[PDB]
Design a protein around this ligand. Structure first.
Ligand SMILES: [Cl-]
Ligand SMILES: [Cl-]
Ligand SMILES: [Cl-]
Ligand SMILES: [Cl-]
Ligand SMILES: [Cl-]
Ligand SMILES: [Cl-]
Ligand SMILES: [Cl-]
Ligand SMILES: [Zn+2]
Ligand SMILES: [Zn+2]
Length: 219
């Protein structure tokens, strides 16, 4: 039952990928991705690590390097996105999630984010971070995060890696809608140079085209 420690690796200027793990029944050890976004001495977390231990490590790294931590946002309700919300809340670090995500956390007896993002589109940190709802896919609540300054789309678990043979855990998925939702994201984010999936290797807009195709054949 050992798991690796969190690691933090640079994607490009001002953008860091955090990778953490959990052992999940039926899947074994699973790697999970989130980001730290830096701008003008401030930091913002996109999805928490998958444990308290790793959330603490990440926050310590941010503070060690002199950055002001403005908070976290989670891109859907499952534990690989939200495990550290309680830890962040208890340490007085602002946590954010959408109305739908916070509703689903409460329904499943989980600690909700302190702040709620309303509507299909939201803006964080004075335009640095844009949150967009493409439609149902992996879950009904899934959102993507666009970083206009970096030309990065963080897809979360709405986007699959290129080596993925399937859509992953589909127990709560909207498979028919997912292909259309993926097209919505493709049409909106033509500028995207880098796309980051919730699990697996980063790439370009090809990840969205592959995800779209996977959804089409899963139907
Ligand atoms: Cl361990
Ligand atoms: Cl990388
Ligand atoms: Cl997930
Ligand atoms: Cl929604
Ligand atoms: Cl997933
Ligand atoms: Cl695979
Ligand atoms: Cl997966
Ligand atoms: Zn999920
Ligand atoms: Zn996931």
């Amino acid at each position: 039952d050992e798991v690796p420690e969190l690691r933090i690796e640079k994607v490009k200027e001002n953008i860091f990928l955090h990778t953490s793990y959990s052992r999940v029944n039926g899947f074994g050890l699973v790697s999970s991705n989130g980001l730290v976004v830096i701008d003008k001495g401030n930091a913002f977390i996109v999805d928490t690590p998958w444990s308290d231990r790793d959330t603490e490590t990440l926050v310590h790294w941010i503070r060690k390097n002199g950055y002001e931590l403005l908070g976290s946002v989670s891109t859907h309700w499952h534990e690989d996105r939200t495990a550290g919300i309680k830890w962040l809340n208890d340490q007085s670090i602002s946590t954010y999630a959408t109305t739908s995500t916070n509703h689903l956390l409460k329904e499943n007896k989980k600690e909700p984010a302190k702040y709620t993002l309303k509507g299909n589109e939201s803006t964080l940190v004075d335009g640095l971070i844009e949150v967009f709802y493409p439609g149902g896919g992996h879950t009904i609540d899934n959102v993507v995060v666009w970083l206009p300054k970096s030309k990065i789309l963080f897809g979360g678990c709405f986007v699959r890696s290129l080596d993925s043979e399937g859509l992953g855990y589909t127990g709560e998925a909207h498979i028919d809608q997912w292909s259309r939702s993926a097209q919505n994201a493709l049409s909106r984010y033509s500028e995207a140079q880098i796309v980051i999936p919730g699990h697996g290797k980063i790439g370009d807009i090809a990840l969205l085209k592959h995800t779209k195709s996977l959804a089409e054949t899963a139907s």
